[PDB]
């Protein structure tokens, strides 16, 4: 997409050379923001073939709040295998914080229900927020939250959402990340009888790995195509009742997929 | 400053009309980002007279972690009086989370020391973060964090910082907000023997109150002047040992101050 390709080019033109968790070098910039008007189409990259299968399953999994990968495994979703232990546990990652943030007084805060409550009764609230950045539980998580915090906003009958992504592998992870949150906005909007607004993506350490340079140049040589349209076949009673089959994508005509090799 | 005035104009041109905590109407946009290269000068607005007295005291107060306004009062800083109770308490606001985030297992996490530890031993970390958004303690705070989360970044010997501001009164609060964080970056950089980089400001619900429109148009008619220079007269042994007198501003030549009337 235009916004995505412009970010790739920006990292290439302005990125500084360094390293990551000590391994593969990277070109990186700090601080970036882009906006996707969801009324213009579902933001699924077209300059390379992407699939929504894992994205959808992971999101439904997040919303359920169970951090064991059992559900993902039953559906052959393996993106979390790398971080899961023998029992399939990941510690209190995303879902646990979204649905049951533990407080010092023994309570479990349901941030998703809280946000829906706010969108329904106080849509102009300036604190319709979900945070996965639970400082007191970071050490127990298999992975510190990458999509760390997000906020909702309502205006002119439309729901918008801004995500703060602390770290981002532009080539491998970003396409997945944008589609995931765009899907969440559509689901939240449907439950609130609102139209979709903008998805605002804000990033911290935004980078391209050195071994993805040829792949990036290849993608940049391709012309973006019209964005597809997301179709929600059913209207569930609540945000926790969506099913994999409820989602469909129309008019998706991407360029060939590009593999993303990673070092270990 | 150029960046500040451009935001004012953007809210005027693109802002949507609505309301706040039910009271004064506002013009607002959602999602914005601007960057201040601290090497170009200290970002203290010049199109209206600003003072750093309260800003400095509040920051030193944050760093100490005590949320009682006693210190502020002793120095005639009254910006928190509005929210403090009879005893001068505010609940677990900013400072408490910065220095002693309570965990469910009975610990108090010092995020400031953690960040300094990271800048010293792992400057390329993609999670050098401080969060004040403690979901489990929001109800006990006199005010939910407005400057909610910030992240540091190091490149080419320079320290950068990005702040996520969930809500922002562009006319009254923003000038204060930018200077406060710019000061923190300078202090953090000095302690780490680094040069200052960029301060990246990211906002959520960014607005202008209806009763600040004339004031905004007046400020927009004024030409920004060269930014001043921050002078740190001393080099403390740690981030917790700064004193009010350690800071001085040179070359500050602003336009006259503009009062900001607020409804109650």
Swiss-Prot record, chains A, B:
Coiled coil location: none
Binding site for (6R)-5,10-methylene-5,6,7,8-tetrahydrofolate: 51, 169, 263
Subcellular location: Cytoplasm
Keyword annotations: Cytoplasm, Formylation, Methyltransferase, Nucleotide biosynthesis, Repressor, RNA-binding, Transferase, Translation regulation
Active site: 146 (nucleophile)
EC number in record: 2.1.1.45
Modification comment: Although not discussed in the published references, Met-1 is represented in the submitted PDB entries as being modified by either a formyl, or a carboxyl group. The N-terminal is probably N-(dihydroxymethyl)methionine, the hydrated form of N-formylmethionine.
Residues the entry annotates as binding dUMP: 21, 126-127, 166-169, 177, 207-209
Top EC class of this enzyme: transferase
SUPFAM superfamilies with a match to the protein in the record: Thymidylate synthase/dCMP hydroxymethylase
Reactions the enzyme catalyzes: dUMP + (6R)-5,10-methylene-5,6,7,8-tetrahydrofolate = 7,8-dihydrofolate + dTMP
Gene Ontology terms describing biological process: dTMP biosynthetic process; dTTP biosynthetic process; methylation; regulation of translation; response to radiation
GO annotations of cellular component type: cytosol
Domain of life: Bacteria
CDD domains in UniProt: TS_Pyrimidine_HMase
Pfam families: Thymidylat_synt
PROSITE patterns in alphabetical order: THYMIDYLATE_SYNTHASE
Pathway linked to the protein: Pyrimidine metabolism; dTTP biosynthesis
One GO molecular-function entry: protein homodimerization activity
NCBIfam families in UniProt: PRK01827.1-3 (NF002497), PRK01827.1-5 (NF002499), thym_sym (TIGR03284)
Membership in a protein family: Belongs to the thymidylate synthase family. Bacterial-type ThyA subfamily.
HAMAP family: Thymidy_synth_bact
Subunit structure: Homodimer.
Function per UniProt: Catalyzes the reductive methylation of 2'-deoxyuridine-5'-monophosphate (dUMP) to 2'-deoxythymidine-5'-monophosphate (dTMP) while utilizing 5,10-methylenetetrahydrofolate (mTHF) as the methyl donor and reductant in the reaction, yielding dihydrofolate (DHF) as a by-product. This enzymatic reaction provides an intracellular de novo source of dTMP, an essential precursor for DNA biosynthesis. This protein also binds to its mRNA thus repressing its own translation.
Name of the protein in question: Thymidylate synthase
Organism name: Escherichia coli (strain K12)
Encoding gene, per UniProt annotation: thyA
């Amino acid at each position: 997409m235009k916004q995505y390709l412009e970010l790739m080019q920006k990292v290439l033109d302005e990125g500084t050379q360094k390293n990551d968790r000590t391994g593969t070098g990277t070109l990186s910039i700090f601080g970036h923001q882009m906006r996707f008007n969801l009324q213009d189409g579902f933001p699924l990259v077209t300059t390379k073939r992407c699939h929504l299968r894992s994205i959808i399953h992971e999101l439904l999994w997040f919303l359920q709040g169970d951090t064991n990968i059992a559900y993902l495994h039953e559906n052959n979703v393996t993106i979390w295998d790398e971080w899961a232990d023998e029992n399939g546990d990941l510690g209190p990652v995303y879902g646990k914080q979204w649905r049951a943030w533990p407080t010092p007084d023994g309570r479990h805060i349901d941030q998703i229900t809280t946000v829906l409550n706010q969108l329904k009764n106080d849509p102009d609230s300036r604190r319709i927020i979900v945070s996965a950045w639970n400082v007191g539980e970071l050490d127990k998580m298999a992975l510190a939250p990458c999509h760390a915090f997000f906020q909702f906003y309502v205006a002119d009958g439309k729901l918008s959402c801004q995500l703060y992504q602390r770290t981002c592998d532009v080539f491998l992870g970003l396409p997945f990340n944008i589609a995931s949150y765009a899907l969440l906005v559509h689901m939240m909007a449907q439950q609130c009888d609102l139209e979709v607004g903008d998805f605002v993506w804000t990033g911290g350490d935004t980078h391209l790995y050195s071994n993805h340079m040829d792949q990036t140049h290849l993608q940049l040589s391709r012309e973006p195509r019209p964005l597809p349209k997301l179709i929600i076949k059913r209207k569930p009673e609540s945000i926790f009742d969506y099913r994999f089959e409820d989602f469909e994508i129309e008019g998706y005509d991407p360029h060939p997929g590009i593999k993303a090799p990673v070092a270990i």
